[PDB]
Every structure is written in structure tokens, then in C-alpha cells.
Amino acid sequence: PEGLEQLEAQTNFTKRELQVLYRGFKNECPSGVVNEDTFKQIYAQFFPHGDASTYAHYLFNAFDTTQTGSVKFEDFVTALSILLRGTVHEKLRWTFNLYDINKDGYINKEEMMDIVKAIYDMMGKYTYPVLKEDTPRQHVDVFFQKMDKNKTLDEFLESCQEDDNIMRSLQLFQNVM
Amino acid sequence: PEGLEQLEAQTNFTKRELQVLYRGFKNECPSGVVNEDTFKQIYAQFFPHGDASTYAHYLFNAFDTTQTGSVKFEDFVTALSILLRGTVHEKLRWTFNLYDINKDGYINKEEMMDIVKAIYDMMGKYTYPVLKEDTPRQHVDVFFQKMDKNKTLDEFLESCQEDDNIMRSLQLFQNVM
Amino acid sequence: PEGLEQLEAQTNFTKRELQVLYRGFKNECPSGVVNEDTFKQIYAQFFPHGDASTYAHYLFNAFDTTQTGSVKFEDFVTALSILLRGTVHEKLRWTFNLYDINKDGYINKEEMMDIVKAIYDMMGKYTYPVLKEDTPRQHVDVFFQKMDKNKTLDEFLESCQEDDNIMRSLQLFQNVM
Amino acid sequence: PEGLEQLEAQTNFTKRELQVLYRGFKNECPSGVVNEDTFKQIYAQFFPHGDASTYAHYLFNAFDTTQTGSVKFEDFVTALSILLRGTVHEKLRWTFNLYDINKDGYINKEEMMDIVKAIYDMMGKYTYPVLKEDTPRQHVDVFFQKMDKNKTLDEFLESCQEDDNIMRSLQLFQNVM
Amino acid sequence: AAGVAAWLPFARAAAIGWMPVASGPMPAPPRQERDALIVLNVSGTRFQTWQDTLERYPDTLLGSSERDFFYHPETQQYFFDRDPDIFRHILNFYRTGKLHYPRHECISAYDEELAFFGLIPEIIGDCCYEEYKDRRRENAERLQDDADTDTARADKRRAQKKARLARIRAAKSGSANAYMQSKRSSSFETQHHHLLHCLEKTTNHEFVD
Amino acid sequence: AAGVAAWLPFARAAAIGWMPVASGPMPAPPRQERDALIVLNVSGTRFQTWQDTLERYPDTLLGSSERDFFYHPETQQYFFDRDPDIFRHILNFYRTGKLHYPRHECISAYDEELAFFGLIPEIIGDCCYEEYKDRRRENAERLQDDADTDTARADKRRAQKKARLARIRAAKSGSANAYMQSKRSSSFETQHHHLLHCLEKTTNHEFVD
Amino acid sequence: AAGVAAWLPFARAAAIGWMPVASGPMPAPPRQERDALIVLNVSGTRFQTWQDTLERYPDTLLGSSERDFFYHPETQQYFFDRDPDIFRHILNFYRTGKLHYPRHECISAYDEELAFFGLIPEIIGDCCYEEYKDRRRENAERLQDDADTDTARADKRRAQKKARLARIRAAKSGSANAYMQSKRSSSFETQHHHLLHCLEKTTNHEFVD
Amino acid sequence: AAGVAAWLPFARAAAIGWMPVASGPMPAPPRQERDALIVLNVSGTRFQTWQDTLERYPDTLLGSSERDFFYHPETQQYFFDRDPDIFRHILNFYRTGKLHYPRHECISAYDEELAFFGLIPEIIGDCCYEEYKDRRRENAERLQDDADTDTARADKRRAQKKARLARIRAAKSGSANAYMQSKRSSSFETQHHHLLHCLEKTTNHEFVD
């Protein structure tokens, strides 16, 4: 919480970028810390078709390291840097921990049922295929068909690195902000 | 409605002139559109001897193309440019449409009875000849004596171009604003 | 009432001096004209020992040419210029008209009884000689002993010009403001 | 009370230092004079463990020359200059008069009983030795063991100048402000 | 929405979670261009705000191509000729999103600035909206009482309306008399009198006292 | 009128309709001369307005040759020594045409600025004119109670009037004592004492304690 | 404490009295480093204060390393995008130590600035604290009435809450329609629509009207 | 008096009337020295007034040699660290002679500026003096209720007084704990802790938790 401490010192933001981020952050939550409710209020504005509160809950849990209850500016900025301008390894670990709802690191097709369910539910009901009750399960099943060999973190890393398409989609936003 | 769109792009006003016109226009009607009532309020201030509301009604109808109900800034400015700094042909068509009250373009000595009546009525009753009930009819009759050959737009154009005095009076205000 | 009209154009004040005088004048009377009451309010502040209202009345009457009722800025400034930086002839005429209470120009030892009475009364009653009831009459008598030959304007002018002491006392304030 | 009068003219403060001191002084007491109560309010803030009001009373009495009742800025600044950047002789006389409660200059082990009592009492009761009821008396006794030969100002001066440790402790604060 | 626009890097970082469970289609990022604070000089008082702050509400005067009409180029600032102590609440709206109502400002002048700058009385915050509605109601009642059409507290209102009409008539008569005096023997007055002369001499009639 | 002066090109364009039905007499347009915004520094606070905005009401201080008295040349600005937060309403009048009354400003100071700048309490807008009249009535009642001539809530008013008279007498006595002290042994004080000396020694009398 | 910091030379001078009755231990003075006034530009209005004035309360935004986030370097000033007429009371707190409450300012905006700058409603002075509490109570009652959860003076509050919800729904529908129009054929709008496209095409689904 | 000082040429011109009826004694005019407006920067907001305007009341802070303490030389301006919206009334007093009371300003802060700048509550104009006295009475009643010495609307006043005392005690304990932490292991904090160390080690005693 200094401005120079979170400079290009394992944080991928410059001084001006840090200043802009702090101005925007304190504009919404002047207290310097943002909680789950306000997290959802900002997140739901970008996706007005449906409700993103279900996904914003898991997103906040991923952001809120150590389950403090409210996420401050320092860890918020380091999470943003890891996700946007971070390396492959950090991004993949962050996504794995986002999917990993419980404490220990495991994925069992029920922990991430809610993740895909929220990703589909944050679109409302206005899409062309009119969705379906079983389409998130189909998406999860086809997802497990490319990494789950027998029944982990190493598997997730190697599966992501094997296919170049997710590789080139992860780095979409590092060039522009 | 851009400022550069209505620049010297068939609009005879410069950037500074456009800025001054918009400042003055929005000073009176901040909404950016002016209606018939406000039209009359500004018009009647320049002629305090009588009431110019009768003439301001036809003037607004001429300004309000397509009979929308309220005239915005873009068509207001293009009408001002046509009248002040426009060419002969545009000015004559604008005046003809001002006299032409109905939809189709005709003049029958009854449509413009009201025009001359309003022009005379916007002086009040304080003139030296004390006016008369039949003097607008005499003015209309002497007007028809120079263009109405048998019983139109082409006739109006050719009559205006034949006499150089109306020609030199039309361009009175293009030199000064 | 222009600022350039009352410039060094028979008014002995410069542009900056006129600006300062107008600022000070409008500070007390914002209306631009000062009446007898306000005249007395400013005049009595300079002489707190007694009351200068009696003398301020005659002073205002001298300032208020044509007996309008309230003296404006233009004649106020020209009177100030005449008194302070004017010539001998103008100062002497102004003083003579100040003493000359009535319309026609005469001094009869009763018109200026009030002038000397007010000059003595604007000191209160705290002086060393404790004044006297008959001392203004003695002052007027000794004044008449040097100009009144037999029983006028020419006499006043010649008497003032004959004695150099009043001459050198009149121009006391032209050097400093 | 001029700013230049109390400049480096037997006052050891520069113009900027004087300006800073006056700003800080008038920030707390805008009237320009500070009394005993406000004196104690500022003094007790620096030592929150106990109460410094007892010592602040004697300090104010030392500051308040001639027992006026309230100490103004000029004598406040000269006292500060004497104490901080003054010479040895002035500092020692000021301290002697601070200890000398009564009018005549004497120290009798009862006048300065209160001084040491207040110095110990402005620490509260939280120290490691938990203090004692008789420790101020022991401090006074050991103090008198080095200057009181038989039973004064000359004795105080010579005792202070004989021991170099109090000498080097007196000028502690002249280097830094 | 555009109100939370400084959280766009936040939304982009959140979107990273979709990539593992996605099928990368090359979604073609827009590749934007790339922020100095701009000045809004509302009659002497300058108000400095970032352009991105104004652009987050692109349906009003300040966030639009409309403010290019009020750009004064050689000083490199936007000069508005409006109230300096009410444009403050316009900027406060642009910063947060909720308008505030000054309890000490006339509501007929507060509404004028809202109409000028494109804001509407529907977006004013709930914190101060009961009092805004109450004062608007009082103003509307004043207007209705003043416009009861009695031509043939309300009594003094009718009296002041008659006085205002008399003042308007006196101003019209004074303008006519000034034109008459000019014909017998300012800047805008000359052009107005030229217009009156044109009206006179297009109908071969002359104005007289 | 001169209030709607920015609509002069509008009126000139409207006048084109008369030309077809006219008999061109060569109405002789005035051929005017041809607009930078000017500064009005009312005691530190600068107010920038176009000169044409001020010139549209040429019967007050701001639109006149009178403001040439307050022009401070080397800074190229008009410096007034008036209230900075009340001249705002003067400019707001010059922009629209209706004065607004501050509910938070003393009416004895609001009237002072109106008297100074040439405006009148008759042109203040109807939106805030009942309260202006009410506060003027309260001020007038205060003045009348303070000037009831009781020489021989109103009781404390008489008490404060007596206290003010005592303070005025004390100030007069202090000025006399200061002059006495100067005779026994500031900038304006020296000239005032010179005037008192002149008054003393023109009547061969001396002031004593 | 740090509030009375300009009296540090006073305390050091007072400490001289301890030296005669002391046993000089060489207490090792810290030997500090050695004061130009700094500028705080709160949206156009600059506020000049000494840095030592701000540093005397090192637990808020202004006295901290936190204001280094708001330092705008090339102009050598701190630019805050906050209310210019409420930061005045922040500085007045930093000068004396007691906050003052504006009777004319909305309490939902006054609390916003206090939350932003780190101050708390517990340090506001006793002089104006009954009215601050009263207005906070009124605001809390308004919030409670607005949040009574009636889903199935308070009646109009429920009506305006329903109107606000309808406006929010209309804004959401308008944003969706704008995205649809963009797909069929601003600055932030392009990136927001890119995000929506990414959400669409990560689930091989398309938004339709 | 010195209040009407711009009318000194008026008084000198009036004195010319005495000369004809005088006996010229060579009254020895003082031959004075000979006026640029000066700046008073009250925390960011600059107030420009003529020096002669301030010098007309030479018994307060602004008209005195006292303001030489607040002169900041390299900027050639007087910098005061006071309230910017209350010094306006100080200047308004210096211009006319009567103080005005802001109905919207806390009276405990209005009196602070009057005490600072040398003015007194006895010179405030009669126009706004009943309300000033009323608000002063309310403040005095608040102080008296808060200082009723109940140690053993007034109930909540006693509650907030107890809360304030608890906060003061907590601040003292926090300062002591901070000093303890520093001893175990800011700018002014270092010097304050050095002073506490000097107090400790002049009595061979140590502070402990």
C-alpha cells in the first residue's frame, strides 16, 4: 500500500497505470476495500442480459485470498496483473484456484458444475438456441474429454499447454490494457 | 449535429460563426430545439410597435420543414445560411415556400393575403397614413400586376430576376453578418 | 459622465486620479449621486470634536449648482478640481459663492455670520479660550476691516490678491493631492 | 510586536523562523496571547502518560514575566530563544528563576520540591521501578549534594559550569531547531 | 454499462476464467488507439476533469460532440457562460452518477442548467429528491397561480403580474420612442433601427409618434 | 429588444421575406465595424464573459462607459472591489435577464451590489421574488423599530442602538485623544491631524483635553 | 500528540528545565533532515497548504503515502476529482482538528468525501454535531423506508423506487439493444461489445433480439 | 475617521473655504510620499484588494504590521491558512465597515476567523446581528450543557461528552503504545519519542507497558 511497493516489482503495472487504477477503484469504493456485494454491483453492469452474481461470487472468492471477507487494493492489483499481464503459469494457477472451490486442489466435475452453470446463466434467456437444462453438463463433459485421462494441477497445466488455441486466447487482453 | 458536419459543407457559416450561433441559440432554448411559441417570443421583441406573432407563425412553418412541430439547430442554421448568405435561387425558393402555405406550390392571391396582412399588422396602428382596411389588398394587387401574366414557381423566379431592384435588395444582409 | 470627458479637459485630474476618485465616491454612495445627508455623514467624520453639519449644509449648497437636490459625480469632480488644483480666480469665485447664500452676489455681514458661526461651531466646546458668544462676530468684524471699503466680488478679488498670506494659504493642498 | 523588532536583534530566530513560530502560535490561540489553561492544554499533549499541568503551571509562571496573567508573543519568543539558542548564562538564569517560585532568588529544598515532584508526576504510574513516595526527595537530596556547600545564583552557576555533563546536555536542542 | 468504465481491466481480467473452458475462436480484440485532464471554464471559474470522466455519459452536452461548439481554441479550453456554482453539481454527477440538489439555489435556475447540459430531473439521487420535488411543486403552484387568466397570496401575485405587464409595455414604448428619436436625428441599436427602417420603407409607410 | 441580440442574424434572415413583396429603396445597411471574452476581477475572483453579453443591457454599470472607471489597464482587466459571491448573480442576470436571490445572503448586502452595479429590485425574476420581498419587509421593520425615535424584541433593539451610539461617541473621543497625543509629541492619520491643525490655527484657537 | 506539532520548539525549550536536575546521559537527538506550500487541485480549484499541515494526521488520505497515488507529476500538484466546496472542510479539519458540517450540503455527499479522504464522522466537532446526527438520522430513515422489502410519504417513496427499478431495467434493455445493433452492423462501447462477443463465442451461443 | 479615507481630497477642498476668512499661518502640510493592489492567498483562493483598503482599519490583523508575519516573500503575496469562504466577509468588512454573518456557516468557525483577524463581534452590522446573537446563544447553551460537571437533549450531550473523553483516553493510550513499540524496535513522531526518552532518562526511570 505505497504506490512504489506495488510498482514494477512483480506487479506488471506502471506508475501511471497504478494511479489510474487507484482512482477508478476508490471512485466506486472510497474506503479502499471492496466487498462481495459491491463486487457484484460492478460485475453485473458489464453483462446486462442476465445476472452475473453467481459467477461474481466465485470470482470474489478467487480474488479474496485467505477468505478475509473484503479484498483491498494491493491484492486486487496483483490479481489483475497476474490475470492480464502475467505469465502463463500464474494465469493457469489462478484459473485453477478459481475453479477449485474447496480448500484442497481438486476438480471432480461437481465443483466446476457451478462455474459453467454461472457462465451460462450470466447470459439470461435470450440466446438463439434458447439454451437447455443439460447444456452446461454437456460443456463440462466435453471439457473433461481433453484433460481428464484417468480421474489435477499438473494435468490442467499440461492440457492447457498442449493445445495452442487456449494458449493464444489467454493472452488476448495483455496487448490492450 | 456535429459542428463539423454543418461547417462550410453547403452551410455558409464558419466554425466561429457556428459556435456563436449555437451559443446564442442555446441561450434562449437550452433544449436545442425551438418551438413556435418561443419563436414568436424572440420575433416579437424586434418589432415592438405591433404584434409579429401572425407573421412569426408562417415564418416558423417555413422553417419547420416536414411539419415536425419544433425546429432543431441543424435545419435552423441551414435556413439562416440560405436566407442570409445563400444564392439567389435558394433564397427565392425559400421565399416562395414561405408564401406557399398549403402543400402544393401555388399562389392564388388568398394564400398570401395573410402574408401581407401580417407584414402590415406587425407595425401596430401608429403610422403616418394611419393605414387602411384595404391597403393590404392594394399591395397584393400591385404585386400581382408584375408577375401574374395569365393566372407559379417559374413565373416568380423570372419576375424576380427581371427586376434588378429586388435583386439588389435580396443581398442586403449578406455583407454584414 | 464618460471618464474621458472629465479628463484633463478643464478638469485637473488624470485618468488614474479620476478612477480612484470614482472608486472612493461610489464606495460610499453606490447610486452615483450624493445628497445632503450623506454629505454631512462623510463631512462630520473628519471633525469629531463638534458638529460640522451646519457648515456641511452651506458646503453642499455650494457644491449643488442649480439647486438640483443631489450632486452627481461630474460636478463633484469639477468642484474638487477647482478647489484643489484650480487657479486663483476660480477658487476665489467658488469661495465667494459659498459665502453668498442668496441668489444675487452680495455679502452683508449677516449672510456670512452663519459661515463663521459654523466654522467655530464645528470645534465643539473644548478649546483653550473656551470660546465666547461674541467671538464669531469679532472674527467677522476684523474680516470686514480689510476688504469692506465703503459698504462685492471685485472687492473680494482685489482684497485677496492684495494680501499675499491668503494667496500662499490657498494653494496649500495643490502640491499634495 | 513588529516582526523586524524581534528579528536577529537579541532574538536568535530568523525572519522565516519567526513567521513559522507566529503561524503555529496563532493557530492555537488566535488572540495573540496564551494563558495558563491553554498553556497546559498544549503542554499535556506531548506527555500523555501522566499529567503535566503541575509542571506547566511553574513553566507558565517562568514564561509570564511580571505576572501579567497571560503571556503574549514577544516574551514567548524571547523565552524560547533564550532556552533553545541562547547562551549558557541566560539559560542558567532562566532555569534558576523557574525553580525560584517566590520573588527573591533563593532555593531552600522546599521551593523545588514541587518542581521535581511535577517532573516525576508527569510520567503517570507505569514506570518499571513503579516509582516511590520518597524518590523525589531522594532526587532533590542528591541534587543538593553537588552544589549546596553550606546552605544561591552564584552557587548554581558555578556548580553547573563545573560539571561538563549538564553543560553538554543544555545545548542538546540548539543544533536541531 | 459506461458508468463503471474504469473497471474495464477488471472485466477483462475476469474474462480470463472463461478461456480454459472455451474453444478459442480468435475473438479479435478491437486494438484501441492507446489522457490529459481538460479544462471547462464556466465564466471565469475553471473546472479540471479527465476527458474519460465526461465521456462515460455520452448522451448529454459534456459527453458528446456537442461540447465542440463551446470549445474556445486559442486558449485550449471549453468556455461555458453558465452558473459557476451549479456546474459543480454537473461535474459531481459525471463523477459518481447521481445529481445533488442545492438547498440554497433557486430551482428555476437549477432546472435551467440541467436543461442546458442535457441532464434530466429523473437521474437526481434519492438522497435529495423529496426536497427537489417539493420545491418543484411550489414553483409549479406559483406558475399556475400566476397563469390563472384573470383578465376581465394570490392577490399580490396578480398585482405583480400586472406590474410586470406594465413594465413590458413601458419597455416597448421606450424602444419605439428611442427609434423615433434616432429617426429624428449604440451598437445593436443601429442594426435594430435599420431593421425597423426596412420594415417602414418596404410598405411605403412611416412610423410617427 | 437588446436582450435577444444574438438573434439579429435570425431577424435579418426573416426580413428576406419582405423583399419579394417590396419596392427596393436601397435601405442603406449600417456597415458595422465587424469578440474576445473580457475579464472582471471582483476582488481576486475573475469572471470571464463576452463583451456582447454585457453590452446587451446598456443602462447599468457593466454595460456602459461607466465600467471604464474600473478598468485596470496594465493587467488588461476590470477590477471591482465588491463581493465575489454576489457578482455571480449580476452576471447571471446579464446572461438571461432575470435576477436570482440568494436565500443565504444578507439582503442589506444584496441590495448594496444591486445599487452599485445599476440593477434594480424590479427586474428580479418571479421565481424568487416573494422571498426577496419578505426579507426586504423584515429588514424594513428592523429599520423602523431601530428608528422609532425613543429619545427622552424591540427592547433589545433599543439597547443595541444605545450601545452603537455609545461606541460611536467612544470612537469620536478616541480620535480626539489621538489627535491630542499627536500634538503633544499612521499614513492617513498625519493628514487628518494636519487638517485639524489647519482648523485650529485658522481661528487662533487650540484644542485641549 | 501530532496535532500540536508547531509547538515542538516549545516542548524542547521546556525540556531545558530538566537538564539542571538531570544526569546528562547523551540522549542522542535524532538529527533531523532540516517547507514550501503544496497544491491540492480538487477539480479545478487549487488549495494551497503546507505539507506539515497535512502530515500532522498521518492516518488519513491527505497525510499519508496514499496521496502519492493522486500526485500528477508534470504539473507538480495533487489532482483530486472530488467536490471543490467540501474539500474546504477537509482542509479546515487538517488545520484545527475539528470537522465542520455544512448545513447547505447533502449529507450523502458529505459522508462520501469523509469516506474518501479517510476522515470519520466521530471527529466532527461538537459545535455542529447535533444537526449532523439529525440529518444522518433522516437519511437512515429514508434508506430504511426505501428498503422495507414490499415485493409481492412512504407511498411516494415506494413509487419512486419502482420507477428507479423500471429505469434500471430500461437501461439494461437499451444496452442489450445497442449491442444487438452493433452486431447487426463509442470508445468504451467497442470494448464492452468485444467482451460481450467473447462471452457469446466461448459457449458457441449467440445473442438475439 | 479613517473609514472615509478616500474622501480626504474632499475634506482638503472643503478646507479651502476657511482660507479667505483666515490669517495664513503656514500650516505646514505633511508632504507625504506620493498603490498597486495586493494579493491575500487564503489557502489557494487569492483575494486582491488595494493596500489602502486594508490600512483604513489599523487595529486589526490585515491593517497592521502584523500581516508582515504572514507575508510569503518569493511569491510576493500574503498566504493565510484560514477558511477561504469566511475571509470574504473579512474583506467585505474592510471595504464598507460592517461585518455580515453567513446564515450557512457554523458560528464556532465564524468566531474563530474574527478572533484570528482581529475583528470583534461588536462591529457586525445591525442587518444581521439578531441572528448572530441567537446562534451565539444556542452555542453558549450547548457549551453550558456540555460543561454542567455531572461527574459522580442533555442526556445525549452527556453521552457524547463521555464518548469524547473515552476517545481522548484511547488516543493517549495509543500514543503511549506507539512510543513503547518504537522503543522495542514518522517525522514528528521521532522527535516526540526523543523527548519522551529524555524525560525517561533524566530520572533514571523507564516506561513499560
Residue numbers in the entry:
A (entry chain B), B (entry chain E), C (entry chain H), D (entry chain F): 36 to 186, 191 to 216
E (entry chain C), F (entry chain G), G (entry chain A), H (entry chain D): 2 to 35, 40 to 157, 418 to 450, 472 to 495
Copy out sentences from the published article reporting this entry, exactly as the authors wrote them.
KChIP1s are laterally anchored next to the T1 domains of Kv4.2, consistent with the previous crystal structures of the Kv4.3 T1 domain–KChIP1 complex. The N-terminal hydrophobic segment (A2–R35) of Kv4.2, referred to as the inactivation ball, was captured by KChIP1, which may explain why Kv4.2 exhibits a closed inactivated (CSI) mechanism, rather than an open inactivated (OSI) mechanism like Kv1.2, as previously discussed for Kv4.326,27. Although the residues from G451 to G471 are disordered, the following second cytoplasmic helix with a short loop (C-terminal segment: S472–D495) fits into the hydrophobic crevice formed by KChIP1 and the Kv4.2 N-terminal segment (A2–R35) from the neighbouring Kv4.2 subunit. In the Kv4.2–KChIP1 complex, KChIP1s bind and sequester the both N-terminal inactivation ball and the C terminus (amino acids 472–495) of Kv4.2, which would therefore result in preventing N-type inactivation.
Modulation of voltage-gated potassium (Kv) channels by auxiliary subunits is central to the physiological function of channels in the brain and heart. Native Kv4 tetrameric channels form macromolecular ternary complexes with two auxiliary β-subunits—intracellular Kv channel-interacting proteins (KChIPs) and transmembrane dipeptidyl peptidase-related proteins (DPPs)—to evoke rapidly activating and inactivating A-type currents, which prevent the backpropagation of action potentials.
